[PDB]
Each structure stands twice: as structure tokens, then as C-alpha cells.
Amino acid sequence: MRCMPVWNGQTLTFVQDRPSDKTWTYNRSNVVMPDDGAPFRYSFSALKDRHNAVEVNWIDPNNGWETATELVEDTQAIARYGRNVTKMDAFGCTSRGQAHRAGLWLIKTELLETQTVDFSVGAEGLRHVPGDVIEICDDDYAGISTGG
Amino acid sequence: DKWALYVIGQYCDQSVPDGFGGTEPRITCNAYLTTQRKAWDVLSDFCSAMRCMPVWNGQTLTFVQDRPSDKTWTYNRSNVVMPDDGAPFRYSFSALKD
Amino acid sequence: AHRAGLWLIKTELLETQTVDFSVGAEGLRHVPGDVIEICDDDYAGISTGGRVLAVNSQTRTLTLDREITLPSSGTALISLVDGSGNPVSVEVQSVTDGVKVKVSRVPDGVAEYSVWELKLPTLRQRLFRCVSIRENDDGTYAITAVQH
Amino acid sequence: MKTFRWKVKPGMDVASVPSVRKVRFGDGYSQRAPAGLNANLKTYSVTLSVPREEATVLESFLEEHGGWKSFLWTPPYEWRQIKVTCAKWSSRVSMLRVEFSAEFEQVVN
Amino acid sequence: MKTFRWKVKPGMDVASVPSVRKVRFGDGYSQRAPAGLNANLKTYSVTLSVPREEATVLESFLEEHGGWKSFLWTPPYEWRQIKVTCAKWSSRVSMLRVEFSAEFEQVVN
Amino acid sequence: MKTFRWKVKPGMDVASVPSVRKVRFGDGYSQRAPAGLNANLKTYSVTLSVPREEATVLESFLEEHGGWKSFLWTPPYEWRQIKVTCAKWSSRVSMLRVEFSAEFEQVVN
Amino acid sequence: MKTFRWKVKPGMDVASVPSVRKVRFGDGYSQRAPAGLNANLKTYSVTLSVPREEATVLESFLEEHGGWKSFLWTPPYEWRQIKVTCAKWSSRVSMLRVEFSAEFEQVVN
Amino acid sequence: MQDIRQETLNECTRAEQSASVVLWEIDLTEVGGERYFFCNEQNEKGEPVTWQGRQYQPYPIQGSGFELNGKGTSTRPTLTVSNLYGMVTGMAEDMQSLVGGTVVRRKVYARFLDAVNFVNGNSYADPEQEVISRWRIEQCSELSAVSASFVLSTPTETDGAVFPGRIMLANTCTWTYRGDECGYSGPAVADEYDQPTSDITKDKCSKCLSGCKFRNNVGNFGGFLSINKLSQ
Ligand code: SF4
């Protein structure tokens, strides 16, 4: 299923990987300051770790209930940045449509979601559980300052 | 360094005793490289099988052949840095089991 | 096979000791493979090498530091740095006092305060061959060499 | 503003402490270089004495720079315009006068 | 209360050290920027002298805030109402009067 | 220029601290050796006083050395010609007087 | 030479502070031992005043020994021949006489 | 012995020398970006440093852990550039589009620099006396609002450099489009979405059999159209 499991600290819940409303907001005025002025540290997924093709595993009833792999490629991405292959096992999946869908989801995730940020924040931390959607404003990334 | 390589080639084209009483060229290839290996590891196996070591000058790539070479630099007490403890040169020996 | 085999064996039996001897700003003069001679004063106790104080071209003579005592039999050598910054070596004939040594010919433009070393004819020369040079971003270079 | 117009009353202490890339070899011998392209820049310990009602104008001028934005200054040492920066400028109030103890660090630009 | 009313001694120190974005590697070219907005905030080393009676009132006022809870104050430097906070307030007790050496740091919040 | 031609105060320090290659584990026996050929290389903490006009001449002279570039010197301590280098030369300017505090460190080079 | 013949006119300072291995157990109790065979060696903070002409002879002697090869001495605190070493002998020149701040460390050999 | 000139060799061994100056050059022409010249200093006049008539801008740039090794390069060198004003973020939309970019680092004593950098002038100025090294970017390690550090590596090692070079694909061509091995020279046929197109600027090969067929060139396909969708 497309979600992540979030232990609230009290209860277990599931947040889907959707465009969600209620997005929190942060800027230089909101997050801590180190001795060096680095409010946000950005790191990027390695070029070589953005697979653009997968061999996805599932059990095929029609073939005889044994492991069959469906292969999912992103043509335009392979046509420009070489061609990386990875292997997945869709969990309960049993019909090739399900496998192909999971395969395509993994590819698009690796290809698009590239950059992470560590921006240790103040006392407001306790309102945030994993899967919360935030927005980041950086003055040295946007030209002039537009938040406070 | 095509010049270095040319010397090396001339060397490994030398005639040497075969071992069954004939003569033979010193080193020759006859590989069939049938996997993706890392470029440097492959280059090192070439330059190991023929006695040399690959030197990335920084600018170019050459081969320094493992031979008695002239042009020997000299280092003594007055030349290398002297740390706080009076040990200009530290030696360390390979293990007998190695 | 037999030749490549014998080569690996003889290297492992004769080359045993490596020396790490971080040097100064002459460290952009070297690249791996370079052959060096480590004239350690620990292995001598007489310190037969140092820097040149003055060079007299006509009536070729070198004014050194320390003392030089010529071997009773055989002719010793003196190893200098040439005008081209190269390791050339020449002979020694007679010594006035214990500093003013007389050479066969003075190499062209032998810079004063350049490295000089006396090698006796009957003595193991003790060669190494460089493997790595590291920069310490203090204008010093850490050198490793293996027995030659 | 681009220039400093107040005068140092009692004189100032200048500390040079240039950068040298230095390597100590064996028997006393060594190696030096000026390290940076322009090593010695020097810092000045500028001391000023101002009336209590006026000190506002000098405070406003020093703060508008705010560490950055180096200004031209003519020290009573060499009598040449040099661009310097102000980082701390400690101030000392009394019932009549205010004393400024500031550090002026010369920059090539 | 939310305001500081007790008069201060001539002994009053003011250090500035505004926040800057300083970037340099080694002894080379250096880039300096105004960091945030409220660049300079200034620390006031102030000293007070009061009789033995209302020393208790002064201590209770400082203790009420107790590091946090910035209060309104008008320093004898700029004569402008600012929010400041007290860090330590080290106190000396003598035979007839008491002394207070305090650190005042102004906060935008 | 390769020499120093200025008048010194009566009060300068000359630290010696010769280089010694010494081995000792814990606090047991210790062996000691002379280490370098040039064992003691001395360090002079020289104080100079100069009129405000000639301060420029002396300041410029020390600047074209800037740590490196050893110059000959004849200290009154022994009246010998030895090669030395300057490190800091922190200077104080008064109304009519300028004071230099320098650490000359003699070198073989 | 082998013997120090110059006289200390004002005295020196003698600190013993010997090397002792010691283990702190539980309820106050402990355990102590002299660590080495020869723990205390009694550092002497020697001060010499010498006329300027005679300063160079003492320099030649001290610098020739140079942080190794101990010399015999009879300190005016116990009046006995002990072998001692010096490492520092910082100097202090004046118009007429020169001061020596030296550290003397007694050695068992 | 390093590829250096006689004057640099004589300078290396002098008791007192001139400044060691390092002049960087980041080229991204091969990766879709621009060429940049940097140095960590400004000349005696506080202007960009001139070398062989080239003006290396003053900018905070430095590198750590450079080495020559004759049996590998374990622990890659690390080059850092100040991200103040955000010109490093402005270099490219995505920071990993900058991987494969070339770095030429030039170490040269200050005595050999151009006569235009000195108020007095230089009698030893020689544009020949410098040491050069070439490195590939492998990864924008990290980027903050103050600094951004790349990992470097010699073109011999890098990461994309593997022997026997050519991976065998099914239904994916590896020749460069209109290149020597592709050997197609006809007019514009289609884009990478296979959509028919008689526009020369928007004609690019999908490198798949469908695209190859559009170009009408299926003889010279750089793939092996039968071999096995899966691997192993
Ligand atoms: S698929 Fe065909 S047209 Fe496209 S690049 Fe390869 S050979 Fe050329």
C-alpha cells in the first residue's frame, strides 16, 4: 500500500504518500542557528542510486503458483542517464498489474525525490510526527527574504 | 605516455628461455576479458603482469617499470621535517606470515 | 606463469621495510615510482650529509657543514642537486681542514644550502621506491616508500 | 559612511602578526613563505573620548557597517587611506564622557 | 512588574559584537554579510547601589523574571524603550548599602 | 637591505632552550642527545623607541620581511653578526614616541 | 667543564614534589609507594647577576653543555656536590649587569 | 619525477620562497553548465589574479586530501566553494546535474605570476611554470547557505569508468544519435516520445526499436533485440 507507518509515541497510524493539506512552514526566523550560519543542510541521492528500471517479484497463479518477475522501465530516463536496474518484491502482489504498478511507483520515487534537509528546530518539535509535510524558505536560495 | 609504453613493449617482446628448451617472447597477452571490472583494477592487472606500476602523474598517466633506474633522489636528517619527538623516518616491516 | 610466479616470490623475500618520512615544499617534485636513498644519521652515527655552505667553481672546492674523513682505500662519491634541480653525483679527491673538500668537477650552478651526501664505495646504498605522496595542506607532503 | 572622521586622542596599539608557511627540517635548517598573497594586514586598538549627548552619531556610523562594509580610514601612524572593518567596539559610559575601545582590522579590499 | 525604574551608577559597559555571515578558508579572500535583520543587540554590564530596605524589592523584581520573561527598560545610552533580560545579577552586601552587578541583553522578542 | 641599524632599550630577554632529543618512559632512566648540529638558536624579545617620522621607515623595513626573509643583525648581547627573522613586532604609538615589541628568532638559513 | 663556579647572591627556590604512585580505596583508607627508586630530584629556580663582560663566558659553558651531559655543583642550601642539568637559562640584559633565570634539575647518574 | 620546469624545481628547494598560489577551474561544458575560474586570494591591488592572461575571480574555494598514489586513490579529494549569495545553487537546477564536471587545479609560486598583479612589476613572470591536475566531480557531498563541498577523483578511477566498456541491452541503443556509429544523416523524423516531428531542433532518438524504425535505420541498432528482458 502507498503509506509509511508512524508510531505517534502513543498509537500506530498510517499516512498515505498523497499531496496532503495542512503543510507546516519554516524559515531562517523559525529554525535554530548554529555558530556557522547553516539553518538547513541539503544532501542529494547519488546519481548511480536513482534506478530507472526494476525487476519486480510476484507469484503468478496462471503460470503455476511460482515466482515470476515483471520488468518496469522508464524509457525517457534510460534514454538520457544510461540504465540502472534494481530488484523489488511487491508484498502481497499476485496479479501482474499490481506488480507493474508497484514497480512504476518505486522508479518514480527514486527518480524525483532526490534532496533531504536536516534543519534541527526549537521547542515546536513535539507537534511533529514522521510523514508531516513542511515547506522551507531560504533567502540565499530565493534572492530576497519573504518570511518571518 | 606512448613513449614509456613503447619502451615497455620492446622489453616484453625480448626472447627468453621457454622452459621446454625453446625460446619465447617474454610477456604476451591472450586474455578474453568477459566481465565488467573497474577500469583501474584492470589497468593495474595489465601493469602488474608486465613488471611496472601505473603512475597518474596528475596531468597524464605513465608506466614506471620496476628496474634499476638512475636519477635517485637523496633524503637525510637536514631535508625531511623533524617532529617534536626526534623521529624523522618511521620504518615498519611486513609480517613473517606474509 | 613461472616467471610471473618467481617475480612475486623474490619481491616478498627481498623487499620488507617501508619508511614514512613527511617532507616539505619539494613534495610537488615527486610522483609515485620515484626512487629515493634514505641516508639516516641513526644508521651512521657520523652524519655524512647536510646542506652546502659555499661553492668555489675555479679550483673546484665545496665548503660544507660537519666533517668529512676520506676512506683510506677506494674513492668515495658526493651526491648534489644540479642547476637543473636533478640528482647528479661526482668524485672526491682531497680534503683541506675537514670542511673544504675537493671534487673532480662542480656541476653547473650548484645552489648553496642544497642537500649533499657522501657515499663510501664499500657500503649498502639502502634504496626505496615511492608509493604515495599526500598533501597536508601546510605545504608539507607525507611520503611512503617501500624497500627497492 | 565610506570614511572615518573622528581622531584618536591618546594613540593606538597596532599588532602585525603576519602569516608564514614555515617548515622545520633536521639540523636547525627550515623553509618559510609569506603563505597568503598579502600576509600582514595588521589590527589597530582605536580609543576615542566623546561627549555623552553626541556619542549617538559615532555609534550609528559604526553600527550601520555591522562587521562587514569596510570603510576608508587614515591612521595617525602612516597617513594613507586603508579600508578597515569594526567587529566589537566596546563602549564605557560615565556621568560626563563615553569611551570607545574598538578593533579596526585592515582588509586589502 | 513589566518595567525597570531604579537609576543606575556611572559604571555601565556596552559591548556590541553584531552577528555576521563570515566565510573564508585559510588566510584568503573573505565574504561578509549582515546575517539576519537585528544585527546588533548589545550587552550592558550595569552596576546599582541601594540601601538595605528595598534591596529585597530589587531582588524579587529580578527573580520574578529569572532569566526568561524580558522586561521594558530605557538605558542611559540611547534613551529608547527596549525589551532586555537579566542573566545572573551577582549581588554584594556591605554594612549600610548593597551593590548589584548585572548583565542586560536586549531581545527583539 | 639585509641588516638592522636601530638603537635598543636596556631591557630585552634572550631565551635559549636548546633542541634535545631525549627518550624517557614514565619517570625512570632518561638518555639525552644534542639532536641538531645548531643546538641552541636563541630568541630576542627586543623593545625599540623611535620618533613618529622614522616609525614609517622601521615599519616598512619589517613589512618587506613579513615573517620570512631572514636579515643579518648584531645584538649587543655578544656583538656577533647572526641571521634573524621577525614574527609579530606589536607597536604602540604615543604623542611623540613609538614603542616596538618584537621576537627575533635567529636562523641558519 | 664539570663544576659550576659562579655564586648565587640572592638565593633560589627549591621544590621537591617527588613521584609517588597511590591508590584511593573506599572508606577513607588508601595505599602509597615511592613509584621509582629515585623519586625526588629537587628543581632549583636559580637567579644569577653578572657584569656584561663576564656574561659571554657563562653563556659558552651553559650552551656547550646544552640540555644534556650534567655538571657537578654545590648549592648553598645543603653544601654538597650534586650532578645537575639546565634546559632554559632565559637572559635579562640591563645597562650594567645581566640576569639569568635558569632551571636546574638534579640527576642520579 | 613530476612534469615541472627548471625554475619551479629550483624554487621548491630554496630556504625562503614566494607564496604557493592555487588556481581552480570548474568546467561544466560537457555536463550542460559553464566554465568558472576561481582563486582563494586577490593580488597586492585587491583585483582578480591574472595567470597566462586569465582572470581567476577572488572567491572562497579550497580543497583537502589531494594525493598521488601508485596503487589507487583510496579517500577521494574534497573541494569546497562558499554558497553565500547562492551562486553554487544557481550553477544548476539539480546539484547532481553537475556530476561528471571537470576540475583543473594549478599550483604555482607567486614569483612566476603575471607582471599586472604587482604595483612594482615582475622580472620573473613566466606563464609556463605551474603544476596541473584534472579531477571529475563525483558527488555534491553537501550544500548549506554558507558552503557546498564536492568529492573529486582522477578520470582514470572516477566511477562510470569500467572496462570492457559496452553493456549489452535489449531494446536500447547506445550509439550517440546522428553520431559516427548510429550513422543516420536524414532529415528530422521524431522526438524521444516517438511523436512524428518535422522540426530539426526537437528531433531526438528514443534509442528504442520504435525510434530506430522512425529514423529507418534498424540495421545499425546499438542493441541486441532478443536477449532477455530480465537479467542474471
Ligand atoms: S536507435 Fe537507431 S537512430 Fe537511434 S541512435 Fe540507435 S542507431 Fe541511431
Side-chain angles (χ1 to χ4, degrees), chain H residues 1 6 15 36 42 44 60 74 79 84 90 92 102 112 133-134 139 142 144 165 170 172 191 218 220 231-232:
Chain H
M1 197 258 315
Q6 191 196 48
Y36 298 125
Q42 326 166 286
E44 310 201 319
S74 28
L79 173 137
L84 213 55
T102 314
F112 299 124
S133 340
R134 329 193 104 88
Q139 184 139 7
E142 64 121 27
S144 36
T172 305
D191 64 333
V218 180
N220 311 10
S231 67
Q232 310 293 244

mmCIF file of all heavy atoms in Angstrom, chain H residues 1 6 15 36 42 44 60 74 79 84 90 92 102 112 133-134 139 142 144 165 170 172 191 218 220 231-232:
data_model
loop_
_atom_site.group_PDB
_atom_site.id
_atom_site.type_symbol
_atom_site.label_atom_id
_atom_site.label_comp_id
_atom_site.label_asym_id
_atom_site.label_seq_id
_atom_site.Cartn_x
_atom_site.Cartn_y
_atom_site.Cartn_z
ATOM 1 N N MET H 1 59.334 11.500 -11.182
ATOM 2 C CA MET H 1 59.557 12.964 -11.205
ATOM 3 C C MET H 1 58.368 13.608 -11.923
ATOM 4 O O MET H 1 58.059 13.216 -13.051
ATOM 5 C CB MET H 1 60.863 13.291 -11.934
ATOM 6 C CG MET H 1 61.409 14.687 -11.683
ATOM 7 S SD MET H 1 61.106 15.876 -13.023
ATOM 8 C CE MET H 1 61.526 14.978 -14.521
ATOM 9 N N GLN H 6 62.373 23.809 -14.835
ATOM 10 C CA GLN H 6 63.640 24.016 -14.081
ATOM 11 C C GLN H 6 63.458 25.063 -12.963
ATOM 12 O O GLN H 6 63.991 24.824 -11.857
ATOM 13 C CB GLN H 6 64.753 24.426 -15.047
ATOM 14 C CG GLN H 6 66.141 24.396 -14.424
ATOM 15 C CD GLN H 6 67.158 25.151 -15.243
ATOM 16 O OE1 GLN H 6 66.925 26.281 -15.668
ATOM 17 N NE2 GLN H 6 68.310 24.535 -15.463
ATOM 18 N N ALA H 15 65.450 27.955 0.788
ATOM 19 C CA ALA H 15 65.232 28.168 2.242
ATOM 20 C C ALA H 15 64.074 29.153 2.497
ATOM 21 O O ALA H 15 63.294 28.899 3.424
ATOM 22 C CB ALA H 15 66.513 28.646 2.881
ATOM 23 N N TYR H 36 34.102 28.157 -14.977
ATOM 24 C CA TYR H 36 34.378 29.087 -13.852
ATOM 25 C C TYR H 36 35.855 29.024 -13.487
ATOM 26 O O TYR H 36 36.424 27.924 -13.424
ATOM 27 C CB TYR H 36 33.521 28.754 -12.629
ATOM 28 C CG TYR H 36 32.040 28.887 -12.877
ATOM 29 C CD1 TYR H 36 31.175 27.834 -12.635
ATOM 30 C CD2 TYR H 36 31.513 30.062 -13.389
ATOM 31 C CE1 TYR H 36 29.816 27.953 -12.868
ATOM 32 C CE2 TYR H 36 30.157 30.199 -13.628
ATOM 33 C CZ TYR H 36 29.308 29.138 -13.370
ATOM 34 O OH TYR H 36 27.970 29.257 -13.608
ATOM 35 N N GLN H 42 43.227 37.602 -3.615
ATOM 36 C CA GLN H 42 43.304 38.782 -4.509
ATOM 37 C C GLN H 42 44.741 39.302 -4.478
ATOM 38 O O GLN H 42 45.355 39.260 -3.391
ATOM 39 C CB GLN H 42 42.348 39.867 -4.026
ATOM 40 C CG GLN H 42 41.079 39.308 -3.413
ATOM 41 C CD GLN H 42 40.304 40.355 -2.657
ATOM 42 O OE1 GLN H 42 40.692 40.757 -1.564
ATOM 43 N NE2 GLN H 42 39.195 40.787 -3.237
ATOM 44 N N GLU H 44 48.094 42.011 -4.827
ATOM 45 C CA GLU H 44 48.525 43.135 -3.947
ATOM 46 C C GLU H 44 47.575 44.339 -4.075
ATOM 47 O O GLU H 44 47.491 45.106 -3.098
ATOM 48 C CB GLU H 44 49.951 43.566 -4.294
ATOM 49 C CG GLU H 44 50.935 42.415 -4.358
ATOM 50 C CD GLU H 44 52.384 42.836 -4.185
ATOM 51 O OE1 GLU H 44 52.765 43.881 -4.750
ATOM 52 O OE2 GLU H 44 53.124 42.124 -3.483
ATOM 53 N N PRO H 60 35.996 32.315 -2.037
ATOM 54 C CA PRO H 60 36.408 31.321 -1.042
ATOM 55 C C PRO H 60 36.218 29.893 -1.588
ATOM 56 O O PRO H 60 35.098 29.414 -1.693
ATOM 57 C CB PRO H 60 35.549 31.606 0.202
ATOM 58 C CG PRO H 60 34.895 32.947 -0.093
ATOM 59 C CD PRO H 60 34.802 33.055 -1.604
ATOM 60 N N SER H 74 42.374 5.641 -2.793
ATOM 61 C CA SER H 74 41.526 5.461 -1.584
ATOM 62 C C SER H 74 41.469 6.776 -0.780
ATOM 63 O O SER H 74 42.555 7.377 -0.556
ATOM 64 C CB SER H 74 42.050 4.311 -0.772
ATOM 65 O OG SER H 74 43.451 4.160 -0.984
ATOM 66 N N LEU H 79 36.658 19.166 -2.504
ATOM 67 C CA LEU H 79 36.779 20.589 -2.871
ATOM 68 C C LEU H 79 35.526 21.305 -2.425
ATOM 69 O O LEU H 79 34.447 20.771 -2.660
ATOM 70 C CB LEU H 79 36.950 20.708 -4.379
ATOM 71 C CG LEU H 79 36.918 22.143 -4.882
ATOM 72 C CD1 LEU H 79 38.004 22.393 -5.924
ATOM 73 C CD2 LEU H 79 35.535 22.468 -5.419
ATOM 74 N N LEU H 84 27.535 31.339 -0.190
ATOM 75 C CA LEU H 84 26.999 32.686 0.125
ATOM 76 C C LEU H 84 26.602 33.353 -1.199
ATOM 77 O O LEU H 84 27.329 33.159 -2.205
ATOM 78 C CB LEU H 84 28.050 33.477 0.909
ATOM 79 C CG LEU H 84 27.497 34.461 1.938
ATOM 80 C CD1 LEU H 84 26.560 33.765 2.917
ATOM 81 C CD2 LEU H 84 28.629 35.160 2.682
ATOM 82 N N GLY H 90 22.728 28.299 -7.888
ATOM 83 C CA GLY H 90 22.443 28.895 -9.212
ATOM 84 C C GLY H 90 23.239 28.262 -10.351
ATOM 85 O O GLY H 90 22.899 28.537 -11.520
ATOM 86 N N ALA H 92 23.273 25.090 -11.302
ATOM 87 C CA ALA H 92 22.332 24.159 -11.988
ATOM 88 C C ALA H 92 21.054 23.957 -11.160
ATOM 89 O O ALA H 92 21.123 24.078 -9.920
ATOM 90 C CB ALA H 92 23.006 22.835 -12.260
ATOM 91 N N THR H 102 34.438 18.710 -14.802
ATOM 92 C CA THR H 102 35.927 18.666 -14.722
ATOM 93 C C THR H 102 36.496 19.766 -13.810
ATOM 94 O O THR H 102 35.997 20.896 -13.827
ATOM 95 C CB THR H 102 36.523 18.855 -16.116
ATOM 96 O OG1 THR H 102 35.764 17.982 -16.959
ATOM 97 C CG2 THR H 102 38.015 18.589 -16.157
ATOM 98 N N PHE H 112 56.199 33.606 -10.244
ATOM 99 C CA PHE H 112 56.032 33.281 -11.682
ATOM 100 C C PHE H 112 54.773 33.947 -12.256
ATOM 101 O O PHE H 112 54.662 33.970 -13.494
ATOM 102 C CB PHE H 112 56.041 31.768 -11.876
ATOM 103 C CG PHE H 112 57.329 31.133 -11.435
ATOM 104 C CD1 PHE H 112 57.333 30.114 -10.495
ATOM 105 C CD2 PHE H 112 58.545 31.569 -11.951
ATOM 106 C CE1 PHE H 112 58.530 29.540 -10.088
ATOM 107 C CE2 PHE H 112 59.739 30.991 -11.543
ATOM 108 C CZ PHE H 112 59.730 29.979 -10.611
ATOM 109 N N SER H 133 46.624 19.410 -12.456
ATOM 110 C CA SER H 133 45.899 18.167 -12.091
ATOM 111 C C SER H 133 44.477 18.270 -12.655
ATOM 112 O O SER H 133 43.928 19.385 -12.621
ATOM 113 C CB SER H 133 45.871 17.979 -10.589
ATOM 114 O OG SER H 133 46.883 18.733 -9.927
ATOM 115 N N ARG H 134 43.888 17.181 -13.154
ATOM 116 C CA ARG H 134 42.474 17.174 -13.636
ATOM 117 C C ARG H 134 41.673 16.158 -12.805
ATOM 118 O O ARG H 134 42.155 15.035 -12.599
ATOM 119 C CB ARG H 134 42.396 16.878 -15.143
ATOM 120 C CG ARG H 134 43.594 17.366 -15.953
ATOM 121 C CD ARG H 134 43.356 17.358 -17.454
ATOM 122 N NE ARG H 134 43.102 18.693 -17.996
ATOM 123 C CZ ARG H 134 44.039 19.556 -18.418
ATOM 124 N NH1 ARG H 134 45.329 19.244 -18.358
ATOM 125 N NH2 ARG H 134 43.678 20.744 -18.888
ATOM 126 N N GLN H 139 30.225 13.748 -6.731
ATOM 127 C CA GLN H 139 29.057 13.953 -5.862
ATOM 128 C C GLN H 139 29.175 15.287 -5.159
ATOM 129 O O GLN H 139 30.119 15.433 -4.403
ATOM 130 C CB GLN H 139 29.006 12.845 -4.812
ATOM 131 C CG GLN H 139 27.769 12.927 -3.934
ATOM 132 C CD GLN H 139 27.162 11.576 -3.645
ATOM 133 O OE1 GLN H 139 27.719 10.533 -3.987
ATOM 134 N NE2 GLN H 139 25.999 11.590 -3.011
ATOM 135 N N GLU H 142 27.566 17.788 0.194
ATOM 136 C CA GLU H 142 26.527 18.556 0.926
ATOM 137 C C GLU H 142 26.532 20.017 0.463
ATOM 138 O O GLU H 142 27.542 20.477 -0.086
ATOM 139 C CB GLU H 142 26.745 18.450 2.437
ATOM 140 C CG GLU H 142 28.050 19.075 2.913
ATOM 141 C CD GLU H 142 27.896 20.197 3.930
ATOM 142 O OE1 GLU H 142 26.886 20.196 4.665
ATOM 143 O OE2 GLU H 142 28.772 21.085 3.967
ATOM 144 N N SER H 144 24.870 23.853 2.072
ATOM 145 C CA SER H 144 24.186 24.685 3.100
ATOM 146 C C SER H 144 24.157 26.128 2.589
ATOM 147 O O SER H 144 24.624 26.344 1.460
ATOM 148 C CB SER H 144 24.863 24.553 4.449
ATOM 149 O OG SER H 144 26.274 24.423 4.313
ATOM 150 N N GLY H 165 33.923 -1.697 -21.975
ATOM 151 C CA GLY H 165 33.029 -0.541 -21.741
ATOM 152 C C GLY H 165 31.528 -0.801 -21.954
ATOM 153 O O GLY H 165 30.713 -0.194 -21.227
ATOM 154 N N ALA H 170 18.825 -4.977 -24.432
ATOM 155 C CA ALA H 170 17.723 -5.377 -25.346
ATOM 156 C C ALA H 170 16.796 -4.176 -25.524
ATOM 157 O O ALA H 170 16.421 -3.537 -24.520
ATOM 158 C CB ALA H 170 16.968 -6.566 -24.805
ATOM 159 N N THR H 172 17.457 -1.165 -26.342
ATOM 160 C CA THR H 172 18.007 0.180 -26.005
ATOM 161 C C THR H 172 19.352 0.412 -26.677
ATOM 162 O O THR H 172 20.310 -0.316 -26.347
ATOM 163 C CB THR H 172 18.182 0.386 -24.505
ATOM 164 O OG1 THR H 172 16.915 0.122 -23.912
ATOM 165 C CG2 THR H 172 18.640 1.785 -24.169
ATOM 166 N N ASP H 191 10.700 12.929 -32.084
ATOM 167 C CA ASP H 191 11.296 13.262 -30.761
ATOM 168 C C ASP H 191 11.518 11.965 -29.960
ATOM 169 O O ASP H 191 11.384 10.867 -30.545
ATOM 170 C CB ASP H 191 10.406 14.251 -29.999
ATOM 171 C CG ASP H 191 9.029 13.707 -29.636
ATOM 172 O OD1 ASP H 191 8.548 12.815 -30.358
ATOM 173 O OD2 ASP H 191 8.447 14.173 -28.630
ATOM 174 N N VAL H 218 17.238 0.392 -38.904
ATOM 175 C CA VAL H 218 17.219 -0.690 -37.887
ATOM 176 C C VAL H 218 18.414 -1.629 -38.070
ATOM 177 O O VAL H 218 18.621 -2.483 -37.176
ATOM 178 C CB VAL H 218 15.904 -1.464 -37.955
ATOM 179 C CG1 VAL H 218 15.877 -2.580 -36.904
ATOM 180 C CG2 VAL H 218 14.723 -0.499 -37.847
ATOM 181 N N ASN H 220 21.615 -0.685 -38.029
ATOM 182 C CA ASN H 220 22.708 -0.186 -37.162
ATOM 183 C C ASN H 220 22.181 0.066 -35.761
ATOM 184 O O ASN H 220 22.654 1.019 -35.133
ATOM 185 C CB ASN H 220 23.310 1.120 -37.673
ATOM 186 C CG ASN H 220 23.651 1.074 -39.144
ATOM 187 O OD1 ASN H 220 23.269 0.132 -39.843
ATOM 188 N ND2 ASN H 220 24.339 2.097 -39.628
ATOM 189 N N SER H 231 17.491 -10.010 -16.138
ATOM 190 C CA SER H 231 18.967 -10.146 -16.038
ATOM 191 C C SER H 231 19.291 -11.513 -15.436
ATOM 192 O O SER H 231 18.389 -12.382 -15.466
ATOM 193 C CB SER H 231 19.542 -9.041 -15.227
ATOM 194 O OG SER H 231 19.111 -9.182 -13.887
ATOM 195 N N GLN H 232 20.522 -11.690 -14.939
ATOM 196 C CA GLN H 232 21.040 -12.952 -14.344
ATOM 197 C C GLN H 232 21.546 -13.859 -15.474
ATOM 198 O O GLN H 232 22.709 -13.771 -15.912
ATOM 199 C CB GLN H 232 19.970 -13.634 -13.481
ATOM 200 C CG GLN H 232 19.292 -12.711 -12.469
ATOM 201 C CD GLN H 232 20.225 -12.244 -11.380
ATOM 202 O OE1 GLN H 232 20.035 -12.558 -10.207
ATOM 203 N NE2 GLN H 232 21.244 -11.487 -11.759
#
